[PDB]
Symmetry: C4
Subunit: 92 residues, 4 copies
């Protein structure tokens, strides 16, 4: 369970470093610094306005922004599910 939690933190930090670089100048409210980025990627991970509120306005400037977010959503959402199920199993 600890190895799963460690993998997500490393992925979350690398993704937020990547996102800061990619979309920080064009969209500074969302990815202007590692802080703003980690908060946006948590919001994207929970799914709240991931497309209409974040990806669609982003994709309008960066046409292939979906190559980052969709695989990010596929990985993090799977891992978070796997982590939460893992805690439940390592309790009974």
């Amino acid at each position: 369970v600890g190895s799963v939690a460690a993998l997500l933190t490393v992925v979350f930090y690398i993704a937020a470093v990547m996102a800061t670089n990619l979309y920080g100048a064009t969209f500074p409210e969302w990815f202007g610094d590692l802080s703003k980025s980690l908060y946006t990627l948590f919001q994207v991970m929970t799914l709240e306005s991931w497309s209409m509120g974040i990806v669609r306005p982003v994709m309008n400037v960066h046409p292939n922004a979906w190559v980052f977010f969709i695989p990010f959503i596929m990985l993090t959402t799977f891992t978070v599910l796997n982590l939460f199920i893992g805690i439940i199993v390592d309790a009974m």
Copy 2:
């Protein structure tokens, strides 16, 4: 698990072919090409603005658009859940 992942891809492509045809002229930002369509159906599958942001404006032009989206949402969301649980078990 591989058979589940293959079934979802085939369904996702057929649905995105269908959606392109159905709502591409009336709503080209959302379903104007197979690309735009696959991205919209992923967004609809995750549930983000599926009704207020997508289905309601669509249904306003195509009254029975819900005959496609609701069963699509029922199938894909079930399959994705089944696939993710399948990886955890295996």
Copy 3:
């Protein structure tokens, strides 16, 4: 699994009959007929704009509208989860 699917259909129809009556005149776009209602309660069940988009504008006219929606969300979301898990169990 069949008994679970039957329970949800009966609940969904009764709730959509109730909602049509309660909020149909004040909010006809959302609950103006059993059809419009079943579609809104499915949207509410999936969670898409349940509060900001539906319950908050409703509660503004019907202060206690939350006595219907929150318990509806607690029951249907639990049952749908229980139904989907039930299919997975009755397969392995």
Copy 4:
């Protein structure tokens, strides 16, 4: 299962007492009283407009509002999942 349901209620009430105090004057539509607060934290827990609709406008006045909501979301969403799975097992 009962102990899990009791833990969530205590956390939900304490969080709604905390939120009322913290953001009630600056955002009274959302956290103006324990009632308004419990309804907002249920909405935040379900995830509906948690950031764009709630946390972002809040954070604009309280820069570190995320120190309350993100850990609240991490705890309640985990507990609700654990509770619902618990009923299914029992």
